[PDB]
Design a protein around this ligand. Structure first.
Ligand code: HEM
Ligand code: HEM
Ligand SMILES: Clc1cccc(-c2cnn[nH]2)c1CCc1ccccc1
Ligand SMILES: Clc1cccc(-c2cnn[nH]2)c1CCc1ccccc1
Lengths: 372, 374
C-alpha cells in the first residue's frame, strides 16, 4: 500500500490522533470537551451562538484538521439535537457553520459527524507504552453521561484495528496471483481468514461496555443525520455557506472502509445491482476519507481473486477462499444479533424490519459467494 | 493507458471492431434482433420472444461476443417491454430471455437494461474495413423501427466519442508531466486535449443531417426509455426466473458516457462532488458503464489535481491552455443545450424543465471552473 493513509498497526484508523488544538481554538475545545454538562444544564445552544467565527488556516497538518472535524462535528450534533428529546435546531449558526463547511471541503468530507471522525480519529491510549486493548484506551469526546459512547466507539475501533492485520496481506495476495505462486496465495488467504475470525471475538466485548437502553434512547439520537429524516425533512441550513438547507446522512459503520474493503478483495459484489443495499454502500463511500476511497477504487481495478481461484481446480485454494467468505458471513451474522438486542428489542419497549432486511441482504450476498 | 481499463488508442471507450454475428447456437436471438422493425410493425415480436427456448450463455466465450449478445438481448428486451411504441406495455420479461440476459448482465457487471455501452459503443461496423471511421463508411448493427433515426443518433454519438478519444491517450502525459515537473510538456498536452475537444464539437454538428426531431422524440426516445421512476412500470420490471420481485433500472443516457465525465474529473470540475441531483445522477450513471471504465474514472479521481497545479505556478501560458480545455467543455455543453431545445423541447410543444435545469447546472459548474474569463 502507498499513500492510501493505511497504517500497519491500526489500518484505516488514524494513528495517535491529536488530542489538543492550537490555542486559537480554545472556544471550540471548551464546548466540545464539556458537552455532557453543557447539554444537561441547557447552556450549550447559547454558547454555540455566542461563538465568534474562527478561521481554519491555523490548522496546518492533517491530524489537526481531523481533530477539528471531530470537535466541530460533535458540537453540531449537540446543537442540532439539544438534550435529545426531540427539540431540533434547523439552522446551524454561521459562526460555526462556515469553518465547519470550509474545513470539510478541504478534507473532501461532508459537513456532519462521520465514522472517520467519531471512531477513527476519536481515541487515545491511556498508557503509551502498553498495548491497544480496551482497558488501556479511552475516547476523546462524549455527548452525555451514560451515553455509552466510549464503549460503542472503542469496540467499533478495536474491530476496525483487528481487521488491519488482514489488510497488509492484500498486497501479497495480488503478487501471488500475478507470479502464479499457489502456495504463497493459499497462505495469504488462510491468514486473512484468521484475522477476520479474530475480529469476531473482539466483537463480543460490545455486550460488556454498551447498554441497549442507553444506546437506543441516547447515543443513537446524537449520531443521527438529516437525510430522509422526518424531523429535518429538508436538511440543515448551513448559515452563511449554503443558500438552502442540505441533506447529509448520519454516521454508519457502512462508512467503515474495512468491511467494504474485503467484499471488494473477494469479489462479493455488494455494490452490484440497483438495490437499496448496493446504493447505500456506494453512497457511504462519499463519507470516507478520500485516501480510503482511492484505496477501494484501486482494489476494484485489480484482477479478481475469486476468478483466479475458481479457474484452478484446486480444493486447497477454494477452501482458503471460502474461509474468508465464511468469516465475513460469521461477522454479519453475529452483527444481526447485536442489532436485535440493541435496536429491535429496545424499540419494542417504548417499521425497522427494513433495517434487518438491509443487513440480511448484505449477509446473503456474502453467503452466495461461497465457492463449494 | 493500462490496457486493463479497456481504452483503445484509436477508438477510446468504444468497443473496437465489434462482433456482428453470434454462434449459430444463438440464431433465434439473432433473428429477432435483426428484424425488430419488421416484427414490431407486424405485431409478431412478442409472440416470437414468448416462443423462445431458454438458451445457455455458456457458449458466449470471448468478451466481444458477450457484448454483442448483451446488445441483442437489450434491443429485444426494449422491443418486448415497449411494443409498437404507444403504451401497450409488458411488465414481465419472459424467463427464457430474462434468465440468460441477467446471467450475462451479472457476468459483465452491467444492469440488465439497454445501456449506452450497448447501443453506441458496441453497435457499429465499418462498411469498408480499409477506409476511415467516417459516417459514410459506418453502419449500426441494430435499430428499433424503420425511420427511427437510430443510425444517425447512435453513429453521431459514436463519432463524437471517437473524436474525444484522441484526447484520452494524452491523459498519462499530463500526470507524468506534473510529476516530473515538466512545464513545457504539460502545456503541449493541455493544448492538445483542448484541440481534440474542439474537434469533437464539430463532429457533433452532423446530428442535424441524420436525425429528424419528430423521429427522435416520438420513436427513438420511446424505445430507449427505462423503468425507474417511470409510471408506465411504476414498480419496475419482473425478470421472471431470476428475481422474484420487479427491479428498477434507468434507461440509456449520454450521462453514461465515460468521455465527458472523464475530462471533468481530469480538470477538477466537480460535477460529482456535492449532494445535489446532477451530482447524484452522474454518480449513479457510473454504475451503467463497463466496469473497466468506471475503474478508469475513479482512478483519475485518485491522482493529484491539474487545476491546483496550474493554479500554483503564476504561468499564464499554462492557465490559458488549462482554460482552453474548460472552454471546449462549455462550448460542447452549450451547443448541446441548443440541440436538446431542437430535439426535445420544441417537439414536446406539439414538466420537462428537469433536463434543462440538469444541463445548465452541469454547464454552469464547468463555466465556473474557468481560471479567467471576466
Ligand atoms: C450496538 C451496536 C451496533 C448497532 C446497533 C449497529 C447497527 C447497525 C445497523 C442498523 C446497520 C444497518 C445499516 C444502517 O442502517 O446504518 C449496521 C451496518 C453495519 N454495521 Fe453495525 N451496529 C452495531 C455495532 C457494530 C460494530 C461495533 C461494528 C464494527 C465495525 C459494525 C459494523 C457494521 C458494518 C460494516 C455495517 C455495514 C453493513 C455491512 O457491511 O455488513 N456494527 N449496523
Ligand atoms: C437529439 C440528440 C440529443 C438529445 C435529445 C439529448 C438529450 C439529453 C438530455 C435530455 C440530457 C439530460 C440528462 C437526461 O435527462 O438524460 C442529456 C445529457 C447529456 N448529453 Fe445529450 N442529447 C442529445 C445528443 C447528445 C450527444 C450526441 C452527446 C455526445 C455524444 C450528448 C452528450 C450528453 C452528456 C455528456 C450528457 C450528460 C451531461 C453532460 O455531461 O453534459 N448528447 N442529453
Ligand atoms: Cl456513528 C457510528 C460509529 C461507529 C459505528 C456505527 C455503526 C454500527 N453499526 N452501524 N453503524 C456508527 C453509526 C451508528 C448508528 C447505527 C444505527 C442507528 C443509529 C446510529
Ligand atoms: Cl440511449 C443513448 C445513446 C446515445 C446518446 C444518448 C443521449 C444523448 N443525450 N443524452 N443521452 C442516449 C440516451 C438518449 C435519450 C435522451 C433523452 C431521453 C431519452 C433517451
Amino acid at each position: 500500500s502507498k499513500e492510501y493513509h493505511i497504517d500497519e498497526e491500526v489500518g484505516f484508523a488514524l494513528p495517535n490522533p491529536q488530542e489538543n488544538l492550537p490555542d486559537f481554538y480554545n472556544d471550540w475545545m471548551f464546548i466540545a470537551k464539556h458537552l455532557p454538562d453543557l447539554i444537561e444544564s441547557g447552556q450549550l445552544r447559547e454558547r454555540v451562538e455566542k461563538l465568534n467565527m474562527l478561521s481554519i488556516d491555523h490548522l496546518t497538518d492533517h491530524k489537526s484538521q481531523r481533530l477539528a472535524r471531530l470537535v466541530l462535528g460533535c458540537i453540531t450534533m449537540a446543537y442540532v439535537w439539544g438534550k435529545g428529546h426531540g427539540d431540533v435546531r434547523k439552522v446551524l449558526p454561521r459562526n460555526i457553520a462556515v469553518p465547519y463547511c470550509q474545513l470539510s471541503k478541504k478534507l473532501e468530507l461532508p459537513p456532519i459527524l462521520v465514522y472517520a471522525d467519531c471512531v477513527l480519529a476519536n481515541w487515545k491510549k491511556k498508557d503509551p507504552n502498553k498495548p491497544l486493548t480496551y482497558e488501556n484506551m479511552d475516547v476523546l469526546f462524549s455527548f452525555r453521561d451514560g451515553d455509552c459512547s466510549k464503549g460503542f466507539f472503542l469496540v467499533s475501533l478495536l474491530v476496525e484495528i483487528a481487521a488491519a492485520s488482514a489488510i497488509k496481506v492484500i498486497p501479497t495476495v495480488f503478487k501471488a496471483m500475478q507470479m502464479q505462486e499457489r502456495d504463497t496465495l493459499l497462505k495469504a488467504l488462510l491468514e486473512i481468514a484468521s484475522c477476520l475470525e479474530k475480529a469476531l471475538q473482539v466483537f463480543h466485548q460490545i455486550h460488556d461496555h454498551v447498554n441497549p437502553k442507553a444506546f437506543f434512547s441516547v447515543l443513537r439520537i446524537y449520531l443521527s443525520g438529516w437525510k430522509g429524516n422526518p424531523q429535518l425533512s429538508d436538511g440543515l441550513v448551513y448559515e452563511g455557506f449554503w443558500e438552502d438547507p442540505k441533506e447529509f446522512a448520519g454516521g454508519s459503520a457502512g462508512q467503515s472502509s474495512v468491511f467494504q474493503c474485503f467484499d471488494v478483495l473477494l469479489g462479493i459484489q455488494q455494490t452490484a445491482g440497483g438495490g437499496h443495499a448496493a446504493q447505500f454502500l456506494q453512497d457511504m463511500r462519499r463519507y470516507m476519507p478520500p485516501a480510503h476511497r482511492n484505496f477501494l477504487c484501486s482494489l476494484e481495478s485489480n484482477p479478481s481473486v475469486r476468478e483466479f481461484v475458481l479457474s484452478k481446480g484446486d480444493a486447497g485454494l477454494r477452501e482458503a477462499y471460502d474461509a474468508c467468505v465464511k468469516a465475513l458471513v460469521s461477522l454479519r451474522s453475529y452483527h444481526l444479533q447485536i442489532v436485535t438486542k440493541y435496536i429491535l428489542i429496545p424499540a419494542s419497549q417504548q417499521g425497522g424490519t427494513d433495517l434487518m432486511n438491509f443487513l440480511k441482504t448484505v449477509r446473503s450476498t456474502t453467503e452466495k459467494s461461497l465457492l463449494k
